[PDB]
């Protein structure tokens, strides 16, 4: 009946913590260089009886992944050739795409050369014909090295020793809330850092029903994340058979111009099976109605955020999603979507610099699982009359939340003090 | 055997019988091939793990328990910390809600432990004829 405190080391106690995580890969400059190869077999230990609160929107793993992708992007772009001198005045004629001849410094400082390259309409603007690249008055530009690949490969985010990652294994788990079935892991599953807007590509699929996750459903300002239970298939091709012309512009420097087109005058596109997309859209509106219906396109000016922007084989595609979002619901024939291509992109020109995606020789074709979506409501009208949904891809972090929704970081507090009827041996 | 943190939801005694699994799997060692942002990260994380481990070992030693795991003290359990009897604590609560209930008074208990151990050692110094 006399109680004394006793120290316990290694008690199952953890607290919510934000720490600097590290990467893991095994099979591409961004992740093949990565860090330490993953363990041959990961240990996922189920924790019986344990119910833990998750919050995907206040998660720090998302911000960590975001800054890590940004820093990796800069580290891989730094050593490559910067096309500062390619801002010469351009004389352009019609072949959209334009044949532009311009002077260029040769290897010898005194000599100059007149070369020609093919440029997409989005890359060039006229001034007073004479033209310039659109970026030259906003920012400098650097050309992505041809060897490095923009293909996302799975990167596992790991917690250090003394910390742990908690993984919710609840199939119907909402974005935030108490998870009745929790297991612990040292590293997450293989997450491909697919850069995308609007529809999500190559993600992980929710089991049982498709999942709708927001920070606040009734708030229009907060986006809507959609995760499929069944993946839809989307085939994207750039049919133009482009050619790469390496023109030397100095000692070592070499610009990769677009040669004359070989083949058809067709623009890149993506097909999606109409049957599967109709089933998926039906299940989507069913889970939408679980909290409440038409779908319309978003029209906001910036082409790279209004269109399903992504990267495929090294070319950056921007896709008209109007075929997917023209609908109204009150409960193969594959649809085809047009995609334009940009080689100059500025996702952070102000933070840093712009990137020139080098042209890809030949026809391009990639097959992608479309696992998710990112939506947004309109401004609140007369209540409960009608609800309209337009697709957005406003930020890249929502993709990280889309794959980090199940994970959470905690630090182990192995020090527990508890009362027993025990006293140390008297001196 | 359930694995690391396997008894997190178990009764405090059921988890207490297998604290050693959690305590052992607390320190890793994940080699390298960094020979970069990733390297800075891996190096920084390396330090923090053994740093927390050594802070905990420091606390264990300054309480007379450098041998780790299970040890007893001369500090009586002041009823103001928690009013529950032995059966309730060891067979009704898990370690998580326990540390939640006692987090208000943890540091006071730590101070009582360090001071009781220091007085024991002063007695040891007195303890020769």
């Amino acid at each position, epitope marked *: 009946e006399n109680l004394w405190v006793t120290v316990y080391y290694g008690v199952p106690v953890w607290k919510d913590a934000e720490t600097t995580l590290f990467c893991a890969s095994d099979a591409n400059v961004w992740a093949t260089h990565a860090c330490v190869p993953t363990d041959p077999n990961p240990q996922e230990i189920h924790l019986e009886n344990v*119910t833990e609160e998750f919050n995907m929107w206040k998660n720090n793993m998302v911000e960590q992944m975001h800054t890590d992708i940004i820093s990796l992007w800069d580290q891989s772009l730094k050593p490559c050739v910067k096309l500062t001198p390619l801002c010469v005045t351009l004389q352009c004629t019609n072949v959209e795409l334009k044949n532009c001849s311009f002077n260029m410094t040769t290897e010898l400082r005194d000599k100059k050369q007149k070369v020609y390259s093919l440029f997409y309409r989005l890359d060039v603007v006229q001034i007073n014909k004479e033209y310039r690249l659109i970026n030259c008055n906003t920012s400098a530009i650097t050309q992505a090295c041809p060897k490095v690949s923009f293909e996302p490969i799975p990167i596992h985010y790991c917690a250090p020793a003394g910390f742990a990652i908690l993984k919710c294994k609840d199939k119907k788990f909402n974005g935030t809330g*108490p998870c009745p079935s929790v297991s612990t892991v040292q590293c997450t599953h293989g997450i491909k850092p697919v850069v995308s807007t609007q529809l999500l590509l190559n993600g992980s699929l929710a089991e049982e029903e498709v999942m709708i996750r927001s920070e606040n459903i009734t708030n229009n300002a907060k986006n809507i994340l959609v995760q499929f239970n069944t993946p839809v298939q989307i085939n994207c091709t750039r049919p133009n058979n482009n050619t790469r012309k390496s023109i030397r512009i100095g000692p070592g420097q070499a610009f990769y111009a677009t040669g004359d087109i070989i083949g058809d005058i067709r623009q890149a596109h993506c097909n999606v099976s109409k049957a599967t997309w109709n089933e998926t859209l039906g299940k989507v509106v069913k889970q939408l109605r679980k909290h409440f219906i038409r779908f319309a396109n978003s029209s906001g000016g910036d082409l790279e955020v209004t269109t399903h922007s992504f990267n495929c084989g090294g070319e950056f595609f921007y896709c008209n999603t109007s075929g997917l979002f023209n609908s109204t619901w009150i409960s193969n024939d594959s649809i085809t979507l047009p995609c334009r291509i940009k080689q100059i992109i500025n996702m952070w020109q102000r933070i840093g610099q712009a990137m020139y995606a080098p042209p890809i020789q030949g026809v391009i074709r990639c097959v992608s699982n479309i696992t998710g979506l990112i939506l947004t409501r309109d401004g609140g009208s007369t209540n409960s009359t009608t609800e309209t949904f337009r697709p957005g891809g406003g930020d890249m972090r929502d993709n990280w939340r889309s794959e980090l929704y199940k994970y959470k970081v905690v630090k182990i507090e192995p020090l527990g003090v508890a009362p027993t009827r025990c006293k140390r041996r008297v001196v | 055997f359930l694995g690391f943190l396997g008894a997190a939801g178990s*009764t405090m005694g059921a988890a207490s019988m297998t604290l050693t699994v959690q305590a052992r799997n607390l320190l890793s060692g994940i080699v390298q091939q960094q020979s970069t942002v990733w390297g800075i990260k891996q190096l920084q994380a390396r330090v923090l793990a053994v740093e927390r481990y050594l802070r905990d070992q420091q606390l264990l030693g300054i309480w007379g328990c450098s041998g780790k795991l299970i040890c007893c003290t001369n500090v009586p359990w002041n009823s103001s910390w928690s009013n529950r009897n032995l059966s309730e604590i060891w067979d*009704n609560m898990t370690w998580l809600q326990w540390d939640k209930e006692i987090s208000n008074y943890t540091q006071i208990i730590y101070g009582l432990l360090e001071e009781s151990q220091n007085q024991q050692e002063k007695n040891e110094q007195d303890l020769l004829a």
Partner: nanobody
Amino acid sequence: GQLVQSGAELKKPGASVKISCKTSGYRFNFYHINWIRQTAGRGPEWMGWISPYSGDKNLAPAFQDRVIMTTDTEVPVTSFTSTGAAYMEIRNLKFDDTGTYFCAKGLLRDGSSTWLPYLWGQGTLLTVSS
């Protein structure tokens, strides 16, 4: 935590009746849920218990063939509490089955008296008459 039982039902002899027991303020999955009755003629009588976690049931021999005990899956509230629901359906009612029925949460998660009814609900009055 609070245990809230269904209100009251009037049933004719030979019929069946289903009493509910909704829980909150504690982890429903952890503590056993017992069903005990009280009649004026025979006094207090323990009927059985059921585990919300495993589904294991233990019925007294007098009610093994006419009483059905069920539980739902716990609905999490925070982490250390939840809401749940258990049901007991008693059939072939007789006049001596008239009385008050209770569901009750157990005492300890482990030990020598895990199922021991510790936290009781307000009771459901069952009347068998014509």
